[PDB]
Design a protein around this nucleic acid. Structure first.
Lengths: 253, 59, 51, 44, 93, 97, 125, 24
RNA sequence: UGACGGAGCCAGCGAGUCUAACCUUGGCCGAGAGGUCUUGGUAAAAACUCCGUCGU
């Protein structure tokens, strides 16, 4: 909790926020990231699979706020039908599409339009490895719209047996709330790492600071492995920045 | 080919010019491409690779 | 039966260019066309000179 | 509303299209950081 | 129509030009065609929506006249419309 | 012998009575088929009505649903150079001569 | 060994291979019953042989047809030609020749395409 | 929760809590 | 002789260790060259059959 106490983090955030109003070039920048310099190489190959960091104190977003796309296994008739009819998940998704339909309908420039329309992309965990080819490069560089894995039903698999195909609307709704409210990160095999912590004009400076400590606590705690405890060896430094602003230091070792 | 010429008007001057790769594959500048500016079409005596670099010898 | 009046430009000339409500929109269209005509001519002369 | 208004409409309807021979109409800390990074690169 | 701006060829206005064209000036009178259009469209039957007017130009161009139209009365303005019609292939409200 | 049982102005828009309420409200700018369906659902107005059949209170409810969407928990997903080029080209032409 | 015959039907690029063997009236196309052939509008086209000669003849045999290539219509014509040719071949090999003659007479009376391939070879003129 | 096919599931799976399941 | 969504299903040509983007925001290492990562923007079988909705 030392980083919250230090005034350097507060003073940097005030400068970063102040700049975004003054500078025209940063007008479209809305999210605040923290850049972490881990002491040693993580050693985890980038699998493009998001890992969720639970932010206990505060909630980054709610399912209602964002344009959510769902990519389901073929056929999508079962999953689309159950989600749409049930009251809880009726309005939870912008659109529901299958992998094959997504490949056929959207190609070339149509992919770029799909990226702009939707703020969050989620997919059945089974089809996730297929998405990089279908969605294209634009989704899978930069980490702004990486698809999130979700499990449709709580049923588990056993070797030499067949999965029963079910859809639990409450469970699907339950996971999606966790994704939007909590922040997420993607491992890579180096020092550097980027995690979203707040949103301009939505979170006050003290709120953003609390999220930062929650992110640091989860990433450093070895008890949270494999999801957490990935930054071993301490943190040399931490910066704060928007998408296009420069990195402002907030903690140095 | 790309990065040889900055606009199609430049390519218009050099149409039919002899060019070769580093590998020794000779070729010709056939025509200027409308999009993007400066790109053009060239035909080589044999298939070239992406690693290769095309060169126009001028004085 | 309902009655309307025809719409027409007195002293019409088809070779002449359709009148445009906005002057900036008309002027740029004049400038764009001069570019296409001028660009096509310059490329043609350069190609002949190169040959 | 008032009864007088409906009289106006009724009379207006009676009064209420070319006809006859009518013709057609005529016509500073951030700046500190920025220099800090730039200064380091040139120093190297 | 013909260039001098394009003008509807007239029997009395353009004698010199029509002699050059070689067609006899006696048969160059749209005023008759204007005249028939005027009387027909103002007749009560057209006002009753039971009349539609078709015109066959001598050259062979066939014109459809919607009954709704209100052609300008003066012969001068009417000539203004025909050149646009023959060139634009249609006239809009 | 005694048995007792066309246009509406909503939101600065005229909607025909005969048309279905959902597709009637689609005509209002910014209102889609899905948005019309949801506003009808929240207003507890049967979608299978016709716009004429709607009562005054139900129309009012639709109005408050539209104007206060966040209050009623609606999700957000509903809510000169040419001359320079010419001069450059002219320089190229003159220079070519 | 079980008595069996094999025949081919061809229409444009569509090719059908029909195996006809002694059996119990099991007709299949691409591993599915003949009733499920699509498009439904042309289904009776495929039925044309079965109805011309009567279902009784098929009651004693199983027909398996595998179709590849071409579009819907060409595949339908390939299937019907293959079925007709296979039935006539089986009646030739393992039944009397008089029935073979009756079948050929009926099919050629109705539509000779059921037996002879329709090849629209180009003719310069 | 683990699926043998897809080891990526065990990391990067949404944590679910009582507050999250409760209706708004 | 429409638009939207879903479902069903049918080709034939083609096989060089060869096949294919651009511009940015920053962290770290490195004497340099450069290496690695991070990040926002720009660009990039169909017909056919069936079912459901709106409606000209």
């Amino acid at each position: 909790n030392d980083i919250i106490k230090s005034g350097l983090a507060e003073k940097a955030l005030k400068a970063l926020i102040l700049q975004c109003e003054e500078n025209p070039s940063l007008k479209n920048d809305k999210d605040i990231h923290i850049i972490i310099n881990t002491g040693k190489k993580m050693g985890i190959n980038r699998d493009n699979i998001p890992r969720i960091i639970p932010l206990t104190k505060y909630k980054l977003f709610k399912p209602r706020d964002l344009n959510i796309l769902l990519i389901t296994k073929d056929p999508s008739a079962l999953y689309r039908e159950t989600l749409t009819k049930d009251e809880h998940t009726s309005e939870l998704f912008k659109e529901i599409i299958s992998v094959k339909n997504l490949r056929r309908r959207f190609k070339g420039s149509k992919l770029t339009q799909l990226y702009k329309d939707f703020d969050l992309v989620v997919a059945d965990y089974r089809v996730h490895h297929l998405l990089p080819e279908v969605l294209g490069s634009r989704f899978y560089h930069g980490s702004k719209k990486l698809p999130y894995m979700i499990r449709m039903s709580k049923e588990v698999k056993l070797k030499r047996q067949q999965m029963v195909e079910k859809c639990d609307p409450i469970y699907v709704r339950a996971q999606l709330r966790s994704i939007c409210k909590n922040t997420s990160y993607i491992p890579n095999n180096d020092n550097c790492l980027s995690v979203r912590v707040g949103y301009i004009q939505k979170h006050s400076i003290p709120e953003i600071l609390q999220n930062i400590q929650d992110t640091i606590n989860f990433l450093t705690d070895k008890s949270k492995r494999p999801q957490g405890g990935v930054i071993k060896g301490g943190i040399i430094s931490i910066f704060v920045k928007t998408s296009n602003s420069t990195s402002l230091p907030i903690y140095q070792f | 080919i790309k990065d040889m010429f900055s606009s199609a008007m430049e390519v218009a001057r050099f149409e039919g010019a002899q060019i070769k790769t580093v590998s020794g594959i000779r070729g010709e500048i056939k025509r200027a491409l409308s999009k993007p500016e400066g790109h053009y079409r060239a035909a080589f005596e044999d298939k070239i690779l992406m690693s290769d670099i095309v060169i126009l010898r001028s004085w | 039966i309902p009655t309307h009046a025809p719409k027409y430009e007195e002293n019409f000339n088809p070779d002449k260019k359709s009148y445009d409500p906005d002057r900036t929109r008309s002027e740029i269209n004049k400038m764009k066309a001069q570019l296409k005509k001028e660009r096509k001519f310059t490329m043609k002369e350069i190609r002949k000179d190169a040959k | 509303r008032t009864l007088r208004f409906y009289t106006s409409k009724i009379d207006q309807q009676e009064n209420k299209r070319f006809k006859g021979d009518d013709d057609i109409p005529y016509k500073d800390y951030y700046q500190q950081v920025q220099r800090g990074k730039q200064d380091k690169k040139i120093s190297r | 129509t013909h260039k001098i701006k394009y003008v509807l060829l007239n029997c009395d206005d353009h004698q010199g030009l029509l002699k050059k064209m070689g067609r006899d000036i006696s048969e160059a009178r749209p005023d008759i065609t204007h005249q028939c259009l005027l009387t027909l469209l103002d007749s009560p039957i057209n006002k009753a929506g039971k009349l539609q007017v078709y015109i066959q130009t001598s050259r062979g161009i066939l014109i459809e006249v919607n009954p709704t139209v209100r052609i300008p009365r003066t012969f001068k303005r009417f000539s203004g419309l025909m050149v646009q019609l023959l060139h634009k292939l249609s006239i809009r409200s | 012998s005694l048995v007792v049982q066309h246009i509406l102005r909503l939101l600065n828009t005229n909607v025909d009575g005969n048309i279905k309420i959902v597709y009637a409200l689609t005509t209002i700018k910014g209102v889609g088929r899905r948005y019309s369906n949801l506003v009808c659902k929240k207003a507890d107005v049967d979608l299978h009505k016709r716009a004429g059949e709607l009562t005054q209170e139900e129309l009012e409810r639709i109005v408050q649903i539209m104007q206060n969407p966040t209050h009623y928990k609606i999700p957000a997903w509903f809510l000169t150079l040419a001359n320079n080029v010419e001069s450059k080209l002219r320089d190229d032409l003159e220079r070519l001569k | 060994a079980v008595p069996s015959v094999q025949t081919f039907g061809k229409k444009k690029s569509a090719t059908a291979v029909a195996h006809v063997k002694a059996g119990k009236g099991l007709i299949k196309v691409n591993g599915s019953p003949i009733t499920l052939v699509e498009p439904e509008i042309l289904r009776f086209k495929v039925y044309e042989p079965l109805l011309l000669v009567g279902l009784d003849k098929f009651s004693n045999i199983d027909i398996r047809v595998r179709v590849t290539g071409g579009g819907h219509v060409s595949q339908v014509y390939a299937i019907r030609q293959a079925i007709a040719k296979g039935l006539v071949a089986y009646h030739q090999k393992y039944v009397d020749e008089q029935s073979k003659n009756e079948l050929k007479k009926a099919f050629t009376s109705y539509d000779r395409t059921l037996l002879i391939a329709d090849s629209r070879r180009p003719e310069p003129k | 929760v683990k699926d043998h096919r897809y080891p990526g599931l065990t990391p990067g799976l949404a944590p679910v809590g009582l507050s999250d399941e409760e209706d708004s």
